[PDB]
Amino acid sequence: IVEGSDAEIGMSPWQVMLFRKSPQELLCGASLISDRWVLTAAHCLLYPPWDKNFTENDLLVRIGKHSRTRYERNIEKISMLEKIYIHPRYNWRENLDRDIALMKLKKPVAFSDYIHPVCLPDRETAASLLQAGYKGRVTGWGNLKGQPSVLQVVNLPIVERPVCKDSTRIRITDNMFCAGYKPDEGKRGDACEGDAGGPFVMKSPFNNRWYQMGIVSWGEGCDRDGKYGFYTHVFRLKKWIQKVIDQF
Amino acid sequence: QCVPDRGQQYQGRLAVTTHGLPCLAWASAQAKALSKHQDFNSAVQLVENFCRNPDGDEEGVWCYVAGKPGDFGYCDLNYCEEAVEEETGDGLDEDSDRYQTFFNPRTFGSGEADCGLRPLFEKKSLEDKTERELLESYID
Ligand SMILES: *C[C@@H](O)[C@H](CCCNC(N)=[NH2+])NC(=O)[C@@H]1CCCN1C(=O)[C@H](N)Cc1ccccc1
Ligand SMILES: *[C@@H]1O[C@H](CO)[C@@H](O[C@@H]2O[C@H](CO)[C@@H](O)[C@H](O)[C@H]2NC(C)=O)[C@H](O)[C@H]1NC(C)=O
Ligand code: NA
Ligand SMILES: [Zn+2]
Ligand SMILES: [Zn+2]
């Protein structure tokens, strides 16, 4: 996260961190949507242009209080993956279209003050909240190129497809959307390669619930003027999520 | 001449992608595997190894090319219409076919009915530092 503020405790109880076993290495952010199902970007597990092809038994997940590092009692809970599900037409050769993966936990996790799942949006919620200018939130580790001690939170407005389109030479699709600040909005901010930002979330004013509308997917550098982070359009991919889960 | 509905009506025999790759059979193991969790239009006939657009992909007709995820390619037809670029919150299809629950507790597990309400905030009527900024931006 670049140009963010200090996260509070259990501000993001859904935030799930993904680590490579050998060596202990942070890969990506993710979100908990039930006691056993974890939503993330396909590009975190699979990207052959970089020779990245991770599997169940190479990966670790950490959940809960990120250990307020006053070296006093650690409770970041550690879970293992039964199954990974990469979207079958994740267009990794072209523009990363359908940048979405599911991960089943080996053992279902118990909910606490620090571990609670995020909602997946319905038709009316998505129609209501997916507007240019409406702000969502990403939480990750701050960028000074790796991770600082305290979680950073950044609020970014959704951008008009026309400005998204005119801002990059990559073919953008209905399965993506871009968020962030235009030059001379004043406010800046972005996610970055490695901060494990994971979910882009929004708070429904109709029922006070946090919904995941996006997944950190791709960008061209970090926090640039006339550039915007791209987010997997979760809602438009919901039928896939339902079909993997309901047919498990 | 030109081809409507980004290939949704196409019945031709074009069996090679735009990278010059040969289409695999719709009916092959590696293709049936990659199709399990996708939502195809039944109207669209998955014949032989012909580039179809079963899932209404607005890029157009395609076909499996190998068996691992991402192993598909598009095919060069002469579309009249570059698909109208809908905005982020437009054209959002319906998901119900019926807070309300969407998933099946057997496979999904518990937590859906309770999702998105944080125990250290929304359960205890405590605003967080920044959530003001979000709710401010949702008015216009
Ligand atoms: C998985 C994450 O580390 C990362 C998210 C980056 C978000 N960046 C900003 N500014 N919000 N993903 C990536 O780095 C993706 C995955 C593979 C390459 N990539 C990129 O963002 C490239 N920089 C650009 C790109 C390459 C291929 C296809 C599309 C975009
Ligand atoms: C990612 O990981 C594994 C490598 O261990 C690959 O899976 C195997 O692929 C071979 C053929 O190349 C098959 O004979 C095996 O049955 C496969 N096993 C499984 C578990 O899939 C996989 O193909 C790799 N993916 C990519 C994109 O390279
Ligand atoms: Na910007
Ligand atoms: Zn290509
Ligand atoms: Zn469209």
Author numbering:
A (entry chain B): 16 to 36, 36A, 37 to 60, 60A, 60B, 60C, 60D, 60E, ...
B (entry chain X): 169 to 266, 277 to 318
Could you share sentences copied from the article?
Trypsin-like proteases utilize a catalytic triad for activity, composed of the highly conserved residues H57, D102 and S195. Binding of a ligand to the active site requires the 215–217 segment to assume an “open” configuration and is precluded in the “closed” one when side chains and backbone shift to occlude access to the primary specificity pocket. We hypothesize that three critical residues decorating access to the active site control the E*-E equilibrium of thrombin.
In this case, acylation of S195 is not possible and PPACK behaves as a reversible binder with a finite value of koff  = 4.6 ± 0.2 s−1 similar to that measured for the chromogenic substrate FPR. Importantly, this result holds over the short (ms) time scale of stopped flow measurements, because longer incubation (weeks) produces acylation of H57, as demonstrated by a crystal structure of the S195A mutant of meizothrombin desF1 solved in the presence of PPACK. Binding of PPACK to the S195A mutant produces two relaxations that can be fit to the same values of k12 = 16 ± 1 s−1 and k21 = 3.8 ± 0.8 s−1 reported for FPR binding under identical solution conditions.
